[PDB]
Motif scaffolding. Structure first.
Motif, PDB file in Angstrom:
ATOM      1  N   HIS A   1      -3.648  -2.759 -18.061  1.00  0.00           N
ATOM      2  CA  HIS A   1      -5.043  -3.291 -18.196  1.00  0.00           C
ATOM      3  C   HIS A   1      -5.731  -3.649 -16.839  1.00  0.00           C
ATOM      4  N   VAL A   2      -4.873  -4.387 -16.250  1.00  0.00           N
ATOM      5  CA  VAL A   2      -5.636  -4.970 -14.885  1.00  0.00           C
ATOM      6  C   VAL A   2      -5.840  -3.939 -13.863  1.00  0.00           C
ATOM      7  N   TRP A   3      -4.811  -2.911 -13.754  1.00  0.00           N
ATOM      8  CA  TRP A   3      -4.946  -1.877 -12.813  1.00  0.00           C
ATOM      9  C   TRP A   3      -6.247  -1.061 -13.033  1.00  0.00           C
ATOM     10  N   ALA A   4      -6.571  -0.849 -14.246  1.00  0.00           N
ATOM     11  CA  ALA A   4      -7.757   0.173 -14.574  1.00  0.00           C
ATOM     12  C   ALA A   4      -9.003  -0.553 -14.073  1.00  0.00           C
ATOM     13  N   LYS A   5      -9.019  -1.981 -14.176  1.00  0.00           N
ATOM     14  CA  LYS A   5     -10.284  -2.671 -13.309  1.00  0.00           C
ATOM     15  C   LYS A   5     -10.079  -2.363 -11.763  1.00  0.00           C
ATOM     16  N   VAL A   6      -8.956  -2.330 -11.297  1.00  0.00           N
ATOM     17  CA  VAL A   6      -8.767  -2.152  -9.805  1.00  0.00           C
ATOM     18  C   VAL A   6      -9.340  -0.694  -9.600  1.00  0.00           C
ATOM     19  N   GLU A   7      -8.594   0.468 -10.448  1.00  0.00           N
ATOM     20  CA  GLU A   7      -9.295   1.711  -9.907  1.00  0.00           C
ATOM     21  C   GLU A   7     -11.012   1.935 -10.115  1.00  0.00           C
ATOM     22  N   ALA A   8     -11.408   0.751 -10.832  1.00  0.00           N
ATOM     23  CA  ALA A   8     -12.811   0.976 -11.273  1.00  0.00           C
ATOM     24  C   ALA A   8     -13.523   0.740  -9.872  1.00  0.00           C
ATOM     25  N   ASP A   9     -12.766   0.210  -8.948  1.00  0.00           N
ATOM     26  CA  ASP A   9     -13.339   0.205  -7.645  1.00  0.00           C
ATOM     27  C   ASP A   9     -12.220  -0.080  -6.748  1.00  0.00           C
ATOM     28  N   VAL A  10     -11.355   1.199  -6.541  1.00  0.00           N
ATOM     29  CA  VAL A  10     -10.220   1.184  -5.644  1.00  0.00           C
ATOM     30  C   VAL A  10     -10.885   0.767  -4.000  1.00  0.00           C
ATOM     31  N   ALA A  11     -11.766   1.629  -3.617  1.00  0.00           N
ATOM     32  CA  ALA A  11     -12.036   1.300  -2.241  1.00  0.00           C
ATOM     33  C   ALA A  11     -12.204  -0.134  -1.920  1.00  0.00           C
ATOM     34  N   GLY A  12     -12.840  -0.947  -2.935  1.00  0.00           N
ATOM     35  CA  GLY A  12     -13.181  -2.230  -2.494  1.00  0.00           C
ATOM     36  C   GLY A  12     -11.953  -3.153  -2.798  1.00  0.00           C
ATOM     37  N   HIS A  13     -10.952  -2.790  -3.628  1.00  0.00           N
ATOM     38  CA  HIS A  13      -9.908  -3.484  -3.844  1.00  0.00           C
ATOM     39  C   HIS A  13      -8.811  -3.126  -2.777  1.00  0.00           C
TER      40      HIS A  13
END
Length: 153
Positions: free
Chosen positions: A12-24
């Motif tokens: 659930h957390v990673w889904a948010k990360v991949e929503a902005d991978v470049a930034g993360h």
């Protein structure tokens, strides 16, 4: 091991990360390099990136941030059944780049730190607890492959 619930938290957390991978990816890599400059050496396109601003502008730095999370996210989505995925991984990092398992630990510290500062109500104590387990399983399953290739530093 992790439970279906724990795996639910991590994905659930990673889904948010991949929503902005470049930034993360930037935050995490920059966070990794600042905390442990030695790991910076392991990238040849970075025999010059000194300031944080320089890291923020490095196109390479960004492309690399996407590679890690992309791959890591792929491994986490396997929820433990990632042995075959780790084979090539351990192969390249152990032999071709000679990255110590200690570095994996460092990047894990950077990942937890960045997710905590970024996804508050999405990375609670329980969530951070589950991610710690996931990344831990990851590291130990990697080291296993490390010794198999006989990786001994």
């Amino acid at each position: 091991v992790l439970s279906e619930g724990e795996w639910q938290l991590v994905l659930h957390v990673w889904a948010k990360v991949e929503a902005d991978v470049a930034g993360h990816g930037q935050d995490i890599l920059i966070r990794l390099f600042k905390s442990h400059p030695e790991t910076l050496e392991k990238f040849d396109r970075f025999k010059h990136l000194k300031t944080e601003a320089e890291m923020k502008a490095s196109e390479d730095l960004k492309k690399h941030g996407v590679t890690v999370l992309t791959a890591l996210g792929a491994i986490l989505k396997k929820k433990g059944h990632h042995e075959a995925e780790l084979k090539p991984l351990a192969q390249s990092h152990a032999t071709k780049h000679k990255i110590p398992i200690k570095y994996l630990e460092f990047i894990s510290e950077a990942i937890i730190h960045v997710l905590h500062s970024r996804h508050p109500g999405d990375f609670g104590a329980d969530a951070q607890g589950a991610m710690n387990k996931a990344l831990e399983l990851f590291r130990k399953d990697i080291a296993a492959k490390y010794k198999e290739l006989g990786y001994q530093g």
